[PDB]
C-alpha cells in the first residue's frame, strides 16, 4: 500500500531531549506515543523504496 | 453533582451496567477466547469525561 507507514502525524522531537531525531508519534496515553515512525528502521514505519505496481 | 439532567443520568446508568464481570459460563463456550472483561472501569482510576 502507498499509505503503509504514513497514516500518523509523527513529528521529530528535535535534538536536546536526549533521543535520536527520528520522527515520533504525537499525543499520549498509549504505547504508541513517543515511538519512532515513518523511517525504514522503525517498527511500524514505511519500508525503504516501497514497491510500485 | 446531585443536580443532574435526565440525559446525563441515563448515560451514567448505562456505564454502571456495563461495569460487571463476565458470566463464568462464557468460559465453557465452544470457541471462547475471552478470559475476563477487559473493559472494566474504575471511578477513581479512569474518568468518564462527562
Amino acid at each position: 500500500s502507498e499509505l503503509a507507514g504514513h497514516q500518523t502525524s509523527a513529528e521529530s522531537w528535535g535534538t536536546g531531549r536526549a533521543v535520536a531525531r527520528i520522527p515520533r508519534v504525537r499525543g499520549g496515553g498509549t504505547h504508541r506515543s513517543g515511538q519512532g515512525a515513518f523511517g525504514n528502521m522503525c517498527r511500524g514505519g514505511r519500508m525503504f523504496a516501497p514497491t510500485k505496481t | 453533582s446531585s443536580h443532574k439532567t435526565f440525559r446525563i443520568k441515563r448515560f451514567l446508568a448505562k456505564k454502571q451496567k456495563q461495569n460487571r464481570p463476565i458470566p463464568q459460563w462464557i468460559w465453557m463456550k465452544t470457541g471462547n477466547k475471552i478470559r475476563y472483561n477487559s473493559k472494566r472501569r474504575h471511578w477513581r482510576r479512569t474518568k468518564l469525561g462527562l
Binding site: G29, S33, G34 | R35, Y36, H42, R45, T46
Partner: peptide, 27 residues
C-alpha cells in the same frame, strides 16, 4: 467450574517531559 480470572485497565503512561533546571549563562 472456573472463577479465578481478574483484571482492571488503566491509562498507559507517557514520559514526554523535560527538566531544564539550569542556565549558566557564562557568555
Amino acid at each position: 467450574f472456573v472463577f479465578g480470572p481478574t483484571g482492571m485497565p488503566g491509562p498507559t503512561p507517557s514520559g514526554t517531559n523535560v527538566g531544564s533546571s539550569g542556565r549558566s549563562p557564562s557568555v
